Amino acid sequence: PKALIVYGSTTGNTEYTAETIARELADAGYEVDSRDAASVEAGGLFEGFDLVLLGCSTWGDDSIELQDDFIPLFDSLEETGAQGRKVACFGCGASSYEYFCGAVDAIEEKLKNLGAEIVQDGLRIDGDPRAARDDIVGWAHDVRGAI
Numbered sequence: 001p002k003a004l005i006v007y008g009s010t011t012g013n014t015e016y017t018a019e020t021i022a023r024e025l026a027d028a029g030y031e032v033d034s035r036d037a038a039s040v041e042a043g044g045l046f047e048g049f050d051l052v053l054l055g056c057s058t059w060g061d062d063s064i065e066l067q068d069d070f071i072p073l074f075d076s077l078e079e080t081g082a083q084g085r086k087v088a089c090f091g092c093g094a095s096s097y098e099y100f101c102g103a104v105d106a107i108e109e110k111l112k113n114l115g116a117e118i119v120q121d122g123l124r125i126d127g128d129p130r131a132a133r134d135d136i137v138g139w140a141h142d143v144r145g146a147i
């Protein structure tokens with residue numbers, strides 16, 4: 001299968017997460033395209049992908065704010081070709097915040113609204129993602145099993 005991974009990461013945690021996931025899928029034989037949301041154009045971005053994994057860190061305090069680089073893609077998510085697309089979301093956050101990984105929640109709801117096929121529940125990482133490598137690898141393993 002061909003998987004596209006697009007991540008928004010301010011301090012590199014969601015980015016580490018996306019590389020962990022990319023490696024897990026590549027090891028299994030998938031063709032993987034892992035791109036920073038900052039370098040992507042939304043227009044037909046998901047076309048030709050069997051699977052699309054969207055990663056985004058959560059910002060804000062009393063409001064969910066999406067990682068800055070992910071914002072333009074989320075704002076134009078309806079142009080990506082998500083309808084019928086197998087997708088899944090992951091992201092880094094902090095459980096002490098009101099909306100822990102609320103960015104995963106917002107993106108998943110938009111994907112749902114665009115007719116995307118959410119193959120697995122979102123991966124929500126609390127704190128340093130390197131300390132949750134087992135969960136990341138496990139979630140990537142489950143997503144492959146799920147498509």
Ligand SMILES: Cc1cc2nc3c(=O)[nH]c(=O)nc-3n(C[C@H](O)[C@H](O)[C@H](O)COP(=O)(O)O)c2cc1C
Pocket residue numbers: 008009010011012013014015056057058059060061063064065067092093094095097098099100101102127128
């Ligand atoms: C000012 C500020 C606001 C934050 N807001 C949230 C939040 O609302 N929910 C959450 O789960 N984490 C929140 N975080 C935690 C970050 O999402 C977390 O540090 C994450 O690991 C950063 O991932 P990144 O390096 O891929 O951008 C916040 C962090 C800061 C510093």
